[model samples]
Target: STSLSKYFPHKVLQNWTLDPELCAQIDDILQKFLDDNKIPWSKKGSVLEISTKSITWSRKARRISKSQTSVSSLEGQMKCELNVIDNQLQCKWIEGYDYNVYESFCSALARALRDNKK
Candidate 1:
């Protein structure tokens, strides 16, 4: 299974609609965290790339016919899509899925943005 599909079960698409400039600042703050953490991400046009890893895992399929069940967290990739707009931030996760990590990342952004506002 793909990294995202392996840990996450479904796809998601959502938006955080806000003031025009808030959206702009949110995007900026997200980039700051993205770079500060040295997380792997890319951007093209209005789309941003980000990903999360599963904290734990039980398997790793290294062979086409054989799957190994290992008690460890497997490294995963985000390969997700994001969009920054004048009035919204669009989050699209196709193969990526992980409620814990997703919420944590967004929460970090919110906290960081709030700190900057002070």
Candidate 2:
């Protein structure tokens, strides 16, 4: 018989880590898009569409770590519309069913790129 009291104080355990290769690939893809102007440069520029359908995830877990909670998962293609104005890249994520995930990814991408540039 299961006792409700036994599970009353249960603590959920969850862990997550970014695959280094996956991270690198994501960075590379973004860099390529920016460098090649795959995304629109401005309202006058042509619309650029980048997809990850051809890209394969070739990363393997190296080590196992522990955590109490997990971060949000970001799956599917992330499309960004970028405009370079005044020497600054103004980018926004397209509205999709998972727009929040894309927005989070862009925010993280911006932070990572900013830190790398510095």
Candidate 3:
């Protein structure tokens, strides 16, 4: 499979964090779509834009620690550009690591987006 990072170049800011409330909201929406069968796992690489606030650190140690670990550990907002296509989904972060979170979330988000357009 092709890596999503290969297709797009993303910059990881020095300090950033994932918004739990927004992530939870997205998860909830995705879950509903999955339960209703509105979306399936076949569509991967379809891109979705996420927008959120930024974070700054009080010291170099804090910045280094946050950068080396998961963004969820910090208190800030994160905008992740996610894509679902060809049975795989890629999440591009503005300030964090980029990795796949399995197939379920992709399918659910796609379905929810489609449903919302109606």
Candidate 1's residue-wise lDDT over 66-89, tens digit each?
A: 445454334554556777665766
Candidate 1 lDDT score at position 42 = 76
Which residue ranges in model 2 land beyond 4 Å of their true spot? 1-48, 52-74
Give the candidates in order of TM-score, highest first: 1, 2, 3
* RMSD each, Å: 10.0, 14.9, 14.7
Clashes of each: 1, 0, 5
The candidate, 2 or 3, that scores higher on lDDT is 3
Candidates 1 and 3 compared by TM-score, better number: 1
TM-scores of all models?
Answer: 0.56, 0.38, 0.26
Give the range where candidate 1 is weakest over 10 consecutive residues by summed lDDT.
Answer: 56-65
lDDT of 2 by residue, 63-86 (tens): 111223253222455455544433
lDDT of 3 by residue, 31-93 (tens): 454445322223234555543332222233246555765553333444555543333344555
Q: How many backbone clashes does candidate 1 have?
A: 1
Give the best candidate by lDDT: 1
